[PDB]
Amino acid sequence: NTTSSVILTNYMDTQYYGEIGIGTPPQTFKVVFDTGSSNVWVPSSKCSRLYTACVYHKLFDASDSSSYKHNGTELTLRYSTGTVSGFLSQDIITVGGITVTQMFGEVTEMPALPFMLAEFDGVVGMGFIEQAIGRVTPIFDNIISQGVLKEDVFSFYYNRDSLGGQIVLGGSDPQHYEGNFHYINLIKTGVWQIQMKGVSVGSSTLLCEDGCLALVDTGASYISGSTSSIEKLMEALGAKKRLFDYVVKCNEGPTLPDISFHLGGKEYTLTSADYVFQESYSSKKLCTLAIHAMDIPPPTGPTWALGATFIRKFYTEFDRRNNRIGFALAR
Amino acid sequence: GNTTSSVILTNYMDTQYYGEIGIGTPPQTFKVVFDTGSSNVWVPSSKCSRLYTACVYHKLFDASDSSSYKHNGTELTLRYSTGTVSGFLSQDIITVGGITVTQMFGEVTEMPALPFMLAEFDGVVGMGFIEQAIGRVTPIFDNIISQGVLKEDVFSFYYNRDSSLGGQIVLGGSDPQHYEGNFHYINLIKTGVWQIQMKGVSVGSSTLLCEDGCLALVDTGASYISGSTSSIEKLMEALGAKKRLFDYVVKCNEGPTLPDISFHLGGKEYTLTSADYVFQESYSSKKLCTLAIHAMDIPPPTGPTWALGATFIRKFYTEFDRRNNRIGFALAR
Ligand SMILES: CCCCNC(=O)[C@H](C)C[C@H](O)[C@@H](N)C[C@H](CNC(=O)c1ccccc1OCCCOC)C(C)C
Ligand SMILES: CCCCNC(=O)[C@H](C)C[C@H](O)[C@@H](N)C[C@H](CNC(=O)c1ccccc1OCCCOC)C(C)C
């Protein structure tokens, strides 16, 4: 019976990473926990000094984990934000309390933009075996294997910028949501994607009636749409593009409509407050939105994806055993 | 025997963790610190001259309202690492969460404003052993233990990342809703004090410091992790932080990059990443955020020691096991 709770760090509301320890003795890295992919990886005490990205991070030393059993496979993880390439090996990862012996990637090649913007070191994928590049069996399907935690559900709390945020493997941590869940169902097992039958703005449904797809990605900073969805949405908030990104001007952020994401029956609404990055109400300044365009490519893509922005407002729970997702007001 | 009481605590800015005791019949309630570095109990006294303006700003024990107060009057002076208080003895019934003890305590009559003008708590409930209690005033935990009440002769401290309950002490056990993983116990070097042998602090990668060994008192009534000036400043050299008089300070936009500090308590490696020890009020180029580790030299009564205060208890649930004279740490949640 377990609830293993991993406490997270909220770095500027653009990224929340918590920590695993790998090896015996454990070597701890800060990692993001990603429901949009399935492979666990950390940098290697091997990663080329010329990837400022290796240099900078923390690096796994395969020769200090007594328990380490190498394997070899050149792994190539193409992520929607950049592609890392390393080689596969085995050790003991400690998650919270739990201890799983898990094959992971040792990243060797690591392309600086963006993993040097990564304030973290690696990713644990809470995704599916079906997404796992090279059928390496993911940590949750594997922790599940040993049968220790008490429900195979795991949930995410992301806090506003303090606690920071937590993952609870085994159930929900009830102090951080209010009311009871209402679940939405996976379209097909293999992805934590669900169906939005619309995105409204204030009142009027603007797009995505005759619904479009929703990836629920905990390893994502924002709400994302296709360039042109996001276009029409910005176009309606009044928000305008500055150079990179869209802004609105701070004193007017109170004015903006709500977006409402109609997920299966219910409506998950977000106010200006939840999506405008409000460093003041100054009349004299521009304030960024936390909704962003990002083209996800088509295995998985092209899809809208609900990352941190959504999850700060709604506690999410990933009900692995019923292949569905729950949401409740987070607090 | 069998009982567990739990005291609840209020967390003021991860710096002050105070709970509340009731002394007297009727009870005068006082906000106090449950301190494992000292072993006397004291509260400000009605007789404190209000020229000490800490006594103007605190709540005082007016002993002519307790029907139970038993005079005793021996003066004692309490010399803490941060400042000294002086006063005399008294006896009355203190309540420490449900449990009731008659207890000899100090009525403090001279309370120097620095640093107690700065303290949200009114007094101290020393949780140490009798070998460090000034004047042998048999410590509150030995009194509850002679009462035959508790399920186990242990107390546990849970200090919470501030922001709903601030923390919780359990008397007689350990609450497994605030720890995960298994306990890890480190034995005491001597009986008399909650101090354990520690070998090597690691900044980032290599055992930078306390290589061969040094002591670590695990003091719940202290906000920071302390180390000897002669040793912290080298740790501080490495982290590259600045001295600003009483604390250390780093340019705020560095914080979230500063290398993990690791502690080697008795056979495992307890580790703080840079959230754990950095008071991130900003991510600016300007603004200096404060590191929550700073130097301070505990005097050689209790050796010169590293003191592991609320920055470590905040991550590892601590069970002070008096019964086997050892301290166990586990993960907090
Ligand atoms: C198996 C190959 C992946 C297939 N699936 C995908 O690519 C999904 C569309 C999305 C994918 O999971 C995506 N979440 C990956 C993320 C993206 N991370 C970054 O690119 C990243 C780098 C620097 C700074 C921030 C970044 O995002 C962190 C967001 C997490 O904080 C909540 C991983 C690497 C932590
Ligand atoms: C029995 C006499 C032995 C004295 N020995 C010692 O001085 C010990 C080594 C340290 C001692 O435990 C020390 N921690 C005492 C504490 C320290 N507190 C303060 O100095 C202090 C003053 C103002 C504001 C806060 C302070 O710290 C409280 C921190 C507790 O919150 C976790 C007392 C005065 C409440």
Swiss-Prot record, chain A:
Chief location category: secreted
Protein's cellular compartments: Secreted; Membrane
Biological process annotations from GO: amyloid-beta metabolic process; angiotensin maturation; cell maturation; cellular response to xenobiotic stimulus; drinking behavior; hormone-mediated signaling pathway; juxtaglomerular apparatus development; kidney development
Catalytic activity entry: Cleavage of Leu-|-Xaa bond in angiotensinogen to generate angiotensin I
Cellular-component GO terms for this entry: apical part of cell; extracellular region; extracellular space; plasma membrane
Any GO molecular function: peptidase activity
Disulfide-bonded cysteines: 47-54, 208-212, 250-287
Glycosylation sites: 1, 71
EC number(s) from the headed UniProt entry: 3.4.23.15
Chain ranges of the Peptidase A1 domain: 16-328
Residues of the active site: 34, 217
Activity regulation remarks: Interaction with ATP6AP2 results in a 5-fold increased efficiency in angiotensinogen processing.
Keywords, comma-separated and alphabetical: Aspartyl protease, Cleavage on pair of basic residues, Disease variant, Disulfide bond, Glycoprotein, Hydrolase, Membrane, Protease, Secreted, Signal, Zymogen
Enzyme class: hydrolase
Self-association state and partner proteins as the record states: Interacts with ATP6AP2.
Pathology linked to this chain's protein: Renal tubular dysgenesis: Autosomal recessive severe disorder of renal tubular development characterized by persistent fetal anuria and perinatal death, probably due to pulmonary hypoplasia from early-onset oligohydramnios (the Potter phenotype).
Family according to the record: Belongs to the peptidase A1 family.
Function, in words: Renin is a highly specific endopeptidase, whose only known function is to generate angiotensin I from angiotensinogen in the plasma, initiating a cascade of reactions that produce an elevation of blood pressure and increased sodium retention by the kidney.
Official protein name in the record: Renin
Gene: REN
Parent sequence residues shown: 71 to 406 of 406
Swiss-Prot record, chain B:
Residue ranges of domain Peptidase A1 in the record: 17-330
Principal location class: secreted
Subcellular location as annotated: Secreted; Membrane
Glycosylation sites: 2, 72
Summary of the function given for this chain in its UniProt record: Renin is a highly specific endopeptidase, whose only known function is to generate angiotensin I from angiotensinogen in the plasma, initiating a cascade of reactions that produce an elevation of blood pressure and increased sodium retention by the kidney.
Protein family per UniProt: Belongs to the peptidase A1 family.
Protein name as annotated: Renin
Organism annotation: Homo sapiens
Gene name, Swiss-Prot/TrEMBL: REN
